Assembly symmetry: C3
Homo-oligomer: 114 residues x 3
């Protein structure tokens, strides 16, 4: 699984622990060992949500499986919770795009998972 | 709808008002209310297009529906026009990837759009 | 084809000529003309892979066709090799997501392909 957050919250407002917390929580949510999980956080972005520049986040979660209607509803609660608590972003100013990746379309360690 | 522009044009060259203009133009183009439109502009990127470091942009437009052959031609005219007029990027140095998202795969405010 | 690499390696560690090299190698690998290849490299990122902040990369390759089981293995070998030799990123700390784009969903030059 990989989770990317792009946000207009400044770099100094991202707690130093936030990548590790996301890693641990996403491992639990996806059922994957934390060694597999990648996280990327991009602050200081030039962005608007509904025409406003108040704090907001555009995110993505890619996984080989563990994506679907019910699972995605659950992830959105988990991840809105974390962005609200740690980055002080209103949950109605967060979008998360979910991608169920085919193992043939994910490269790692000189080869793909297929 | 979500529109993201990555570009090597410098930050100082992005006009004040660009994100609002994109929000308004996309609301008209997609027919979706401006309150739900997200826009993200990332300048100063290390990029090459055709091996050249002249101004270029790599973009994406995600929407739940309103994506298709004829509609994407129209969006590309619109958005290339804006990037040429506002950021001085030649239309032939712009790619825009279009993504028709399943509502179950777009998280927002503790749930999905499904 | 468009290749994007996000990495926590610092900008000073990206060697001169890296974007040219990627352009040239991806043209060979995909069979597309270099004039149409786009490359984007984003260093200094806040990232973790397996909970470690050691050098790592998250990448994507988008192409209209030329994406599939064998081809993607070949790209991963090529690209992980280049990230290891050029940026000193271990291959087991790289993910590359592959996207086979429909031509109707790629805009360019005031239209689509």
């Amino acid at each position: 699984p990989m989770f990317i957050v792009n946000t207009n919250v400044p770099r100094a407002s991202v707690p130093d622990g936030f990548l590790s917390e996301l890693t641990q929580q996403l491992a639990q949510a996806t059922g994957k060992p934390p060694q597999y999980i990648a996280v990327h956080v991009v602050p200081d972005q030039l962005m608007a949500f509904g025409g406003s520049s108040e704090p907001c986040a555009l995110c993505s979660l890619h996984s080989i499986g563990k994506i679907g209607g019910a699972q995605n509803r659950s992830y959105s609660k988990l991840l809105c919770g974390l962005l609200a608590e740690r980055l002080r972003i209103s949950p109605d100013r967060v979008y998360i795009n979910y991608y169920d990746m085919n193992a043939a379309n994910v490269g790692w360690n000189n080869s793909t998972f297929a």
